[PDB]
Symmetry: C3
């Protein structure tokens, strides 16, 4: 497999955006979970529907419509993705990660990724926020990788390292900010594992995922982090623990989509003020 986008494609899209807005973001945020409401706190916001931006992959976002929003959040200029793309919709990883490279060409230096995730770690409770310290890329093990194919030297090297993908200083700042918020629940931190989806895991799969050392499971984010790190973007991210995974055959029930949506709704306010405060420390 080879990326279908030439360097010029990215550049054209970037040039189109610059000629249609006066905003010049330094931070890019890919919203997941109940963070979709974060667009409501931007100043001087300007919205672009994914369908009107050349080369942008078609939208297929549930709940939060596919919009790219520019604006000032807590004194910082940023651009946000309201709705992202997932492999389970049929998109190749090179379409999924297309926005990350455009962000780089706009002058962006920092990327914040957020998502909803199932809790594998027995100590996580619904509503918990887990800073992503590391990740396990299952699709990557089989070759499914956004960097597969010839390397574009103008973006980065052939063999980029990922052991330092999640910025250390960012996670330090995140802990201080959380303390300053006077939260009773502590800020979690752990390993996120991505798998394809769209179906939810079985008990047997959840037990091995946990045995492999993962704390949370999800169907996104990893390909974006890989491409971001490839082109030199400082990356920071976190998962909203939307549900605890069923790990015993005496299943009290089963993970459902309404459950995760509710969680995203109930924690929205907490996630928004958190990301807003973090802007001041980037």
């Amino acid at each position: 497999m080879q990326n279908g986008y030439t360097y010029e494609d990215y550049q054209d899209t970037a040039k189109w955006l610059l000629s249609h807005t006066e905003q010049r973001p330094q931070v890019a945020v890919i919203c997941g979970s109940g963070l979709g409401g974060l667009v409501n706190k931007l100043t001087q916001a300007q919205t672009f529907d994914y369908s009107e931006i050349p080369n942008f992959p078609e939208s297929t976002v549930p709940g939060h419509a596919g919009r790219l929003v520019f604006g000032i959040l807590n004194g910082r200029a940023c651009v946000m993705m309201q709705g992202r793309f997932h492999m389970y919709e049929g998109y190749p990883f090179w379409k999924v990660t297309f926005p990350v490279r455009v962000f780089r060409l706009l002058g962006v230096e920092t990327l914040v990724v957020t998502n909803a995730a199932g809790g594998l770690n027995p100590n996580f409770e619904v509503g918990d926020i887990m800073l992503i310290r590391d990740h396990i890329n299952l699709p990557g093990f089989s070759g499914e990788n956004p960097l597969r194919g010839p390397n574009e030297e103008r973006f980065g090297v052939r063999f980029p390292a990922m052991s330092d993908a999640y910025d250390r200083d960012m996670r330090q700042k995140a802990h201080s900010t959380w303390k300053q918020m006077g939260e009773q629940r502590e800020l979690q931190e752990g390993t996120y594992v991505m798998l394809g989806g769209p179906n939810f895991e079985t008990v047997a799969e959840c037990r091995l995922l946990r045995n492999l050392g993962a704390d949370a499971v999800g169907m996104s984010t990893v390909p974006e982090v890989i491409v971001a790190r490839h082109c030199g973007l400082r990356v920071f991210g976190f998962s909203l623990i939307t549900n605890k995974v069923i790990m015993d055959t005496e299943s009290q029930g089963k993970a459902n989509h309404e459950e995760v949506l509710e969680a995203g709704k109930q924690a929205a306010q907490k996630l928004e003020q958190f990301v807003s405060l973090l802007m001041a420390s980037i």
Copy 2:
């Protein structure tokens, strides 16, 4: 990747079958192992070669020729697949699972899946029958999934759960029936793990498969169970332990295809009467 079959394709195939047979099955059986002979016990059987049914994937079945057989088994009306499709032949998962959706549109409510498998659990002996209680989907981890691409709402939801894939009541009935058969060997039950194939595993791979909690290994069934559960089919299945996997470098030999064929042959009669008795309890 996206499924190449539109909902209408499935419906056309279903409509063609209904206009060519008076049979109206409630149960669908996908035969594997030595269960291929089960067609010999149907009453009022009517056979359809896969090649004469519109939209049906081309046949590539070894030993048992690709036929779709309708008939009455122990008083119940059912349809059976004599030979299935495997990813290792080159078929995408959406071709492999095509029959499952057609079955749904015919009015079928229950699906019984059977296969041959290598024993990972040290307590299994050749000839053992293992009820499938749960599964581990390795291809699914990388995104290889029959549901990949846009979701067809007329079949099911975007994020179906799989923790309850193998019907509980069915497995209870299976245990009672086995007792009533006066078998000396006990009915096994466990986790089946699917991988792509077509080559057999190495010692190192078998040890990790076992460490991951799998009891039996095979190259099929899982994609069919996923699609079946997606559209609301009650699923029940079992593996015929055709051989015990080599797990030490002092390999007494190596898994071979003739070995598995022999096992399927020697247990044929036992599997047939078992599935026949189960019909009375569905």
Copy 3:
């Protein structure tokens, strides 16, 4: 997926080579690591650029240019691949493994595979040579396999076993030869695990790889061993431990490509005399 090469394609390429050289090799060597210099010790060498050989996949080799070299090494006639293909470049496994089948049709009976690898086993030091005793094929778990699609009976069987892939007698000879070289460091031996790449692993991924029982990690060799064993080639291989993987968050640094190149350079002489001596015992 299905192999795009017909049996005749392989045969044509083989026939073209035979009509352009008088050499008739019995051993084929696929050079990796600092073994790229091994071509300098061939007698009566004759070089073919991959681009001039019909049907040969396009070259994309870093450092060592894609050449196929025929010659006599320590009294034995052999053919060597200076530079191989990797999935991470965009090649399907059937393009990657194309040379292995051509080698078979030339009359070759033995294949020696070498590569660079990251050390997972805590006892390995940079510069170590690890005989490959077994392998773990992650891409294979998801269906990514060079044998996927219809089986070509003229090459081998539908379900080949892999538990005996690495020749036992070859590894015995390798140990004797190493002793005869009077090396202070002992010859290592272990399980190689392949993943897609091109990015390097994260700490979390390295810990699970090690927990799964792997000793060394790399991005090649496995598909070639599978196809070789399929067509009846005696296989022998080893990894040059070019670096030790970062397995703690207090990362002293991070794996980089220059590091691995340096290692390949520093051990070149030792690998060359080793492979040269082994020729005398094949």
